[PDB]
Ligand binder design. Sequence first.
Ligand SMILES: O=CNCCCCc1ccccc1
Lengths: 6, 180
Amino acid sequence: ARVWHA
Amino acid sequence: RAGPVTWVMMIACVVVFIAMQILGDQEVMLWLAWPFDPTLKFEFWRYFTHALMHFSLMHILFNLLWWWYLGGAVEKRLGSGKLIVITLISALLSGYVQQKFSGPWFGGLSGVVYALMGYVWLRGERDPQSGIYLQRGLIIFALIWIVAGWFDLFGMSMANGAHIAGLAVGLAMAFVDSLN
Ligand SMILES: O=CNCCCCc1ccccc1
């Protein structure tokens, strides 16, 4: 895997 | 609505997006993510290149959309150099705040986009002579996006730090610009 979306 | 800075950034996100389809997201994170190990401390591109990674069609399309419109706005009316500084500063601070809150595994131009939302808006409220204003349609849509982030109503984890830091920068900058 999980990644944070910017 | 697309000068050289706006154009190179999109191409860059496109080139990076393509590179993530061929090599897979994970391997490109290893080279462009915010430093996730002491060893990487001095690979300096990483303090900016997280802004170039998008993890899905939706991610890159929405980010590039906003970017093209507001960033391309800032470019033609205020000058390429101004968009450059906005982008360097927001990309840096959003990255920093994001990583402090959720670790280094994040990416996207949206930190930059939120700085553009905040800059194009506040600059027009205090200095409408600038020619720079966030049309009310976009004020609303920008509000919605923001709220979407804070309360997390899409499928993927939002970079909430990158968003808040992003917006802060753009305000401060338009504030400093509207002084006279
Ligand atoms: O992109 C960076 N931060 C959050 C913006 C959300 C972008 C998005 C919108 C809709 C579907 C997927 C991603």
